[PDB]
Amino acid sequence: HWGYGKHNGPEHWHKDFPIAKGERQSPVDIDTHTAKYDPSLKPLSVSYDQATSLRILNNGHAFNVEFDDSQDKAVLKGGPLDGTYRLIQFHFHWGSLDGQGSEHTVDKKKYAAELHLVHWNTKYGDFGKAVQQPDGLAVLGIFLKVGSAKPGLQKVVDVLDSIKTKGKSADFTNFDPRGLLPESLDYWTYPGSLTTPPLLECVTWIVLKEPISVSSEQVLKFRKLNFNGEGEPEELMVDNWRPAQPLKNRQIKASFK
Ligand SMILES: NS(=O)(=O)c1ccc(C(=O)NCC(F)(F)C(F)(F)C(F)(F)C(F)(F)F)cc1
Ligand SMILES: [Zn+2]
């Protein structure tokens, strides 16, 4: 029964999910002065040429664009990662206004939204096994600021009216997630967790330094989605972000000087 409200929001998650107070929780504030350049990191390899999107689903907390991950089509490799991570879905977190919405922050700055491209380590064979491992997932995080429209985001924006409420889905084939990437792949990386229950500590985070720009009209349409199911009292899907968590005994590394 968790969600984002007063009564069921991030401050309450620890009661059903005690790992909420664990040692490697996400998101975190990225203090740009404290993150150390690690000349040993690699260039990330984002290989999305063969990506096969299938469906888009309003799950009551966000919407997921789902991919065929039955074999190695769209994969993330390199950077801080060992081995091959298959793209399974992407989704966003966003705010009620442009001044909040991201989960990670940069020197305490909140972006209007944050995209997460979720990938799982194929050495564990399936996603449900991968989330039980400390190196099971790699989530590529991309900040959104409001300015010029992002042309590669418009197909997502235009299907949202058809999945307004929890449990609705729509066919969503042939979507190219390369159109959501910024120009630079410079990133910060640290070990963390899923940012929604069950909050599993299984994620290598890779957060791109360069935000993408989306238009105010684009993000306004995210904010017309609903957390509720069909016919239920309307609760706009906004502010579905978890705040920054304590860094504890972790190091955030930069891939760039
Ligand atoms: N915001 S995020 O950090 O990018 C992010 C990315 C992905 C998930 C996600 O797959 N939750 C769903 C889930 F994994 F928890 C799961 F239900 F599928 C599960 F596999 F653990 C379970 F519970 F065993 F079935 C959550 C947060
Ligand atoms: Zn997320």
Short mmCIF file of C-alpha atoms and ligand atoms in Angstrom, two decimals:
data_model
loop_
_atom_site.label_atom_id
_atom_site.label_comp_id
_atom_site.label_asym_id
_atom_site.label_seq_id
_atom_site.Cartn_x
_atom_site.Cartn_y
_atom_site.Cartn_z
CA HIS A 1 0.00 0.00 0.00
CA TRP A 2 2.97 2.41 -0.29
CA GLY A 3 2.84 5.52 -2.46
CA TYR A 4 3.87 9.16 -2.36
CA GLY A 5 1.10 10.69 -0.14
CA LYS A 6 1.28 12.06 3.47
CA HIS A 7 0.02 8.89 4.69
CA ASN A 8 1.93 6.32 2.64
CA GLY A 9 4.94 8.30 1.27
CA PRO A 10 8.71 7.78 1.56
CA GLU A 11 8.78 8.62 5.28
CA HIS A 12 6.54 5.61 5.95
CA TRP A 13 8.24 2.99 3.71
CA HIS A 14 10.60 1.76 6.41
CA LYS A 15 7.73 0.11 8.37
CA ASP A 16 7.06 -2.49 5.65
CA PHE A 17 10.58 -2.27 4.11
CA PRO A 18 13.12 -1.83 6.92
CA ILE A 19 16.01 -1.74 4.36
CA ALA A 20 14.72 1.80 3.72
CA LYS A 21 17.16 2.75 6.53
CA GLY A 22 19.98 0.56 5.11
CA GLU A 23 23.57 1.34 4.22
CA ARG A 24 23.30 1.69 0.47
CA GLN A 25 19.98 3.48 -0.22
CA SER A 26 19.13 5.62 -3.23
CA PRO A 27 18.78 8.30 -4.40
CA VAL A 28 21.53 10.53 -2.97
CA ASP A 29 22.77 14.12 -3.34
CA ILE A 30 25.77 14.24 -5.71
CA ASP A 31 28.18 16.76 -4.22
CA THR A 32 30.21 17.72 -7.30
CA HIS A 33 33.13 18.96 -5.36
CA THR A 34 33.49 15.69 -3.28
CA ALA A 35 32.99 13.19 -6.23
CA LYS A 36 36.40 12.10 -7.33
CA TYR A 37 37.46 11.75 -10.94
CA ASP A 38 38.43 8.10 -11.41
CA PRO A 39 40.71 7.83 -14.48
CA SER A 40 40.26 4.07 -14.26
CA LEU A 41 36.54 4.14 -15.17
CA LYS A 42 35.55 3.28 -18.69
CA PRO A 43 33.43 5.09 -21.26
CA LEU A 44 30.02 3.65 -20.87
CA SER A 45 28.76 1.51 -23.77
CA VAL A 46 25.09 2.12 -24.43
CA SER A 47 24.06 -0.30 -27.21
CA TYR A 48 20.42 0.35 -28.02
CA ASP A 49 20.43 -0.16 -31.83
CA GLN A 50 18.46 -3.41 -31.51
CA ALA A 51 16.10 -2.23 -28.72
CA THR A 52 12.54 -3.66 -29.04
CA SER A 53 9.99 -1.71 -27.01
CA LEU A 54 6.69 -3.56 -26.52
CA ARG A 55 4.28 -1.86 -24.19
CA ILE A 56 3.69 1.08 -21.87
CA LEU A 57 2.01 0.50 -18.48
CA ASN A 58 0.66 2.89 -15.79
CA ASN A 59 1.54 0.93 -12.64
CA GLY A 60 0.03 3.43 -10.15
CA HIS A 61 3.43 4.98 -9.26
CA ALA A 62 4.86 5.85 -12.68
CA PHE A 63 4.61 4.59 -16.22
CA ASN A 64 7.03 1.95 -17.54
CA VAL A 65 8.03 1.63 -21.20
CA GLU A 66 8.81 -2.12 -21.36
CA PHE A 67 11.30 -3.86 -23.66
CA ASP A 68 11.79 -7.35 -24.94
CA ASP A 69 14.64 -8.60 -22.66
CA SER A 70 14.32 -12.30 -23.63
CA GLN A 71 17.74 -12.00 -25.34
CA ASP A 72 20.60 -9.42 -25.60
CA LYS A 73 19.07 -6.68 -27.73
CA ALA A 74 19.50 -3.35 -25.92
CA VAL A 75 22.45 -3.60 -23.44
CA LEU A 76 24.56 -1.46 -21.12
CA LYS A 77 28.23 -2.42 -20.64
CA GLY A 78 31.49 -0.73 -19.65
CA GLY A 79 31.76 2.23 -17.33
CA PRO A 80 31.94 0.81 -13.78
CA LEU A 81 30.23 -2.44 -14.86
CA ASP A 82 31.52 -5.99 -15.33
CA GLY A 83 29.58 -7.97 -17.88
CA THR A 84 26.38 -7.30 -19.75
CA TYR A 85 23.17 -5.65 -18.52
CA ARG A 86 19.95 -5.98 -20.57
CA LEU A 87 17.46 -3.09 -20.77
CA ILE A 88 14.10 -4.17 -19.30
CA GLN A 89 12.17 -0.87 -18.90
CA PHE A 90 12.46 2.82 -18.45
CA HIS A 91 10.31 5.23 -16.43
CA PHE A 92 10.48 8.72 -14.95
CA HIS A 93 10.01 10.51 -11.68
CA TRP A 94 8.66 14.09 -11.78
CA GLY A 95 7.28 16.91 -9.77
CA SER A 96 4.11 18.97 -9.38
CA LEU A 97 6.17 22.04 -10.52
CA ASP A 98 9.49 22.38 -12.40
CA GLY A 99 11.52 23.07 -9.21
CA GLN A 100 11.31 19.46 -7.99
CA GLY A 101 10.85 15.96 -9.41
CA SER A 102 14.31 14.39 -9.68
CA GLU A 103 15.42 11.76 -7.18
CA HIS A 104 19.17 12.37 -7.38
CA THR A 105 20.20 15.99 -6.75
CA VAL A 106 23.36 17.77 -7.83
CA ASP A 107 24.78 20.08 -5.14
CA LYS A 108 21.25 19.98 -3.64
CA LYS A 109 19.69 21.14 -6.99
CA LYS A 110 16.47 19.30 -7.89
CA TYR A 111 15.67 18.86 -11.61
CA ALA A 112 12.10 18.84 -12.99
CA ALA A 113 12.28 15.08 -13.60
CA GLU A 114 14.63 12.09 -13.86
CA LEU A 115 14.60 9.22 -16.35
CA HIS A 116 15.69 5.75 -15.25
CA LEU A 117 16.75 3.19 -17.84
CA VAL A 118 16.74 -0.09 -15.94
CA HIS A 119 19.06 -2.96 -16.88
CA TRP A 120 19.80 -6.37 -15.33
CA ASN A 121 22.96 -8.42 -15.19
CA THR A 122 22.56 -11.39 -17.54
CA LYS A 123 24.94 -13.53 -15.43
CA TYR A 124 21.97 -14.08 -13.07
CA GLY A 125 19.71 -15.40 -15.85
CA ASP A 126 16.47 -13.49 -14.98
CA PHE A 127 15.47 -10.15 -13.47
CA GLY A 128 13.97 -11.64 -10.30
CA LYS A 129 17.31 -13.37 -9.52
CA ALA A 130 19.36 -10.26 -10.48
CA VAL A 131 17.57 -8.01 -7.89
CA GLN A 132 18.83 -10.37 -5.12
CA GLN A 133 22.47 -9.58 -5.96
CA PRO A 134 24.61 -6.53 -5.08
CA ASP A 135 25.63 -6.18 -8.72
CA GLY A 136 22.30 -7.30 -10.17
CA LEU A 137 21.06 -4.07 -11.79
CA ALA A 138 22.48 -1.03 -13.51
CA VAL A 139 20.22 2.01 -13.68
CA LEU A 140 21.21 4.81 -16.04
CA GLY A 141 19.74 8.04 -14.66
CA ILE A 142 19.24 11.16 -16.81
CA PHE A 143 18.00 14.50 -15.49
CA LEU A 144 15.29 16.51 -17.24
CA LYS A 145 15.17 20.30 -17.25
CA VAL A 146 12.46 22.38 -18.81
CA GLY A 147 13.29 24.41 -21.90
CA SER A 148 13.21 23.25 -25.52
CA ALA A 149 11.13 20.18 -26.39
CA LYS A 150 12.83 16.79 -26.67
CA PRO A 151 11.66 15.43 -30.06
CA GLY A 152 12.41 11.82 -29.07
CA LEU A 153 10.14 12.12 -26.03
CA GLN A 154 6.98 13.16 -27.94
CA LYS A 155 5.82 9.59 -28.83
CA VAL A 156 5.83 8.80 -25.09
CA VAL A 157 3.92 12.04 -24.27
CA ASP A 158 1.27 11.33 -26.85
CA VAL A 159 0.30 7.89 -25.60
CA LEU A 160 -0.14 9.03 -21.94
CA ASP A 161 -3.85 9.96 -22.45
CA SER A 162 -4.49 6.30 -23.22
CA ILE A 163 -2.96 5.01 -19.95
CA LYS A 164 -4.31 7.65 -17.62
CA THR A 165 -5.07 5.39 -14.64
CA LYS A 166 -3.37 2.58 -12.72
CA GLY A 167 -3.43 -0.77 -14.50
CA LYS A 168 -3.93 0.61 -17.99
CA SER A 169 -1.44 -0.30 -20.70
CA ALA A 170 -1.07 0.30 -24.41
CA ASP A 171 0.92 -1.20 -27.20
CA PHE A 172 4.19 0.73 -27.57
CA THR A 173 6.33 -0.89 -30.25
CA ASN A 174 9.26 0.55 -32.22
CA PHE A 175 10.18 3.28 -29.71
CA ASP A 176 13.89 4.25 -29.91
CA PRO A 177 15.30 5.11 -26.48
CA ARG A 178 18.44 6.59 -28.12
CA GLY A 179 16.26 9.66 -28.63
CA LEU A 180 16.17 10.30 -24.85
CA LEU A 181 19.99 10.47 -24.39
CA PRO A 182 21.96 13.71 -23.97
CA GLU A 183 25.05 14.37 -26.15
CA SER A 184 27.63 13.56 -23.47
CA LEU A 185 27.87 10.24 -21.59
CA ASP A 186 30.03 11.75 -18.73
CA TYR A 187 28.62 10.27 -15.51
CA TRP A 188 28.83 9.83 -11.78
CA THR A 189 28.56 6.32 -10.32
CA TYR A 190 27.95 4.82 -6.86
CA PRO A 191 26.43 1.61 -5.36
CA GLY A 192 22.82 2.00 -4.30
CA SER A 193 19.34 0.64 -4.37
CA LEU A 194 15.94 0.62 -6.03
CA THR A 195 14.26 3.95 -5.14
CA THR A 196 10.79 2.37 -4.66
CA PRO A 197 9.77 -0.50 -2.40
CA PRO A 198 11.15 -3.09 -1.95
CA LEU A 199 14.19 -0.78 -1.99
CA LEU A 200 16.58 -3.68 -2.73
CA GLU A 201 20.28 -2.86 -2.52
CA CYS A 202 21.12 -4.29 -5.94
CA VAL A 203 21.85 -1.28 -8.15
CA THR A 204 24.99 0.21 -9.68
CA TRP A 205 23.84 3.75 -10.35
CA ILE A 206 25.22 5.60 -13.34
CA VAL A 207 23.89 9.20 -13.39
CA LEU A 208 24.67 11.33 -16.45
CA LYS A 209 26.05 14.81 -15.82
CA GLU A 210 24.29 16.43 -18.84
CA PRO A 211 20.52 16.87 -18.48
CA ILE A 212 18.16 16.62 -21.43
CA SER A 213 15.78 19.45 -22.09
CA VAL A 214 12.03 18.80 -22.39
CA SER A 215 9.32 21.43 -22.96
CA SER A 216 6.90 22.71 -20.35
CA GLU A 217 4.07 21.18 -22.46
CA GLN A 218 5.79 17.78 -22.37
CA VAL A 219 6.14 17.68 -18.60
CA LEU A 220 2.59 19.12 -18.09
CA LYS A 221 1.27 15.98 -19.83
CA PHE A 222 3.16 13.70 -17.40
CA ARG A 223 1.35 15.61 -14.62
CA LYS A 224 -2.09 14.71 -16.06
CA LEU A 225 -1.58 11.04 -15.33
CA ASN A 226 -3.31 9.51 -12.30
CA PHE A 227 -2.06 7.39 -9.42
CA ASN A 228 -5.58 6.08 -8.95
CA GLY A 229 -7.42 3.39 -10.91
CA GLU A 230 -10.31 4.09 -13.40
CA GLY A 231 -13.36 5.72 -11.88
CA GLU A 232 -11.64 6.30 -8.45
CA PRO A 233 -11.18 9.78 -6.92
CA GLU A 234 -8.61 11.59 -9.10
CA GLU A 235 -5.14 11.86 -7.58
CA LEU A 236 -2.76 13.43 -10.09
CA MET A 237 0.47 11.43 -10.60
CA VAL A 238 2.93 14.13 -9.50
CA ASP A 239 5.80 14.20 -6.97
CA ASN A 240 6.49 10.47 -7.40
CA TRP A 241 10.16 10.90 -6.29
CA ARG A 242 11.94 9.67 -3.20
CA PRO A 243 14.18 12.35 -1.51
CA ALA A 244 17.93 12.00 -1.15
CA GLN A 245 19.11 9.42 1.41
CA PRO A 246 22.22 9.39 3.56
CA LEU A 247 25.40 8.62 1.64
CA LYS A 248 26.94 6.68 4.59
CA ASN A 249 30.10 4.81 3.77
CA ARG A 250 30.02 5.37 -0.01
CA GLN A 251 32.05 7.06 -2.62
CA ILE A 252 30.59 8.76 -5.71
CA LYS A 253 33.06 8.53 -8.60
CA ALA A 254 33.15 10.84 -11.69
CA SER A 255 34.08 9.55 -15.15
CA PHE A 256 35.28 13.02 -16.18
CA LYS A 257 37.93 15.52 -14.98
N1 LIG B 1 13.40 3.76 -9.49
S1 LIG B 1 14.50 2.63 -9.83
O1 LIG B 1 15.43 2.56 -8.72
O2 LIG B 1 15.05 2.82 -11.18
C1 LIG B 1 13.66 1.13 -9.86
C2 LIG B 1 13.83 0.20 -10.96
C3 LIG B 1 13.15 -1.01 -10.98
C4 LIG B 1 12.30 -1.34 -9.92
C5 LIG B 1 11.54 -2.63 -9.95
O3 LIG B 1 11.76 -3.43 -10.89
N2 LIG B 1 10.67 -2.94 -8.99
C6 LIG B 1 9.90 -4.16 -9.01
C7 LIG B 1 10.67 -5.23 -8.23
F1 LIG B 1 11.91 -5.40 -8.65
F2 LIG B 1 10.81 -4.85 -6.99
C8 LIG B 1 10.07 -6.59 -8.35
F3 LIG B 1 8.84 -6.47 -7.91
F4 LIG B 1 9.98 -6.92 -9.67
C9 LIG B 1 11.02 -7.58 -7.58
F5 LIG B 1 11.70 -8.13 -8.60
F6 LIG B 1 11.84 -7.21 -6.50
C10 LIG B 1 10.14 -8.54 -6.87
F7 LIG B 1 9.67 -7.74 -5.86
F8 LIG B 1 10.95 -9.51 -6.43
F9 LIG B 1 9.27 -8.97 -7.83
C11 LIG B 1 12.13 -0.47 -8.83
C12 LIG B 1 12.81 0.76 -8.76
ZN ZN B 2 13.11 5.11 -10.94
#
